A = this chain, B = another copy of it.
Amino acid sequence: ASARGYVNIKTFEQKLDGNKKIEGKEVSVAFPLYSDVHKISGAHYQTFPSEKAAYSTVYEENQRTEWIAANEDLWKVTG
């Protein structure tokens, strides 16, 4: 487990362009990893801490490059 805290980012999907979306993604982050690296701003989200991970997408103490690719994936634009 993370053993500390879970910062839980839930992005809310939206229509960016014609027949295109930025898919909203429920994701959880181990708190020490989150405070170190998070790119989220202007991303149409809302965040809350929780003792246990509150979303089915869970990132533990050690991922880094696995998570660094997931947060910038919150901006992925799909049709």
Q: Is the interface of A mostly helix, strand, loop or mixed?
A: loop
Q: Could you say which residues of chain B place their CB within 8 Å of the CB of A17?
A: 12-13, 24
Flag A13-33 by CB within 8 Å of B: 1 or 0 each.
111011001011000000010
Which listed residue (B3, B24, B32, B61) contacts A18, Cβ 8 A? B24
A62 within 8 A of B: yes
| Least Cβ–Cβ distance between A23 and chain B, in angstroms | 7
Q: Could you say which residues of chain B place their CB within 8 Å of the CB of A1?
A: 61-62
How far apart are the CA atoms of A17 and B23 in the complex, in Å? 9
Query: A interface vs B, CB < 8 Å?
Result: 1, 3, 12-15, 17-18, 21, 23-24, 32, 61-62
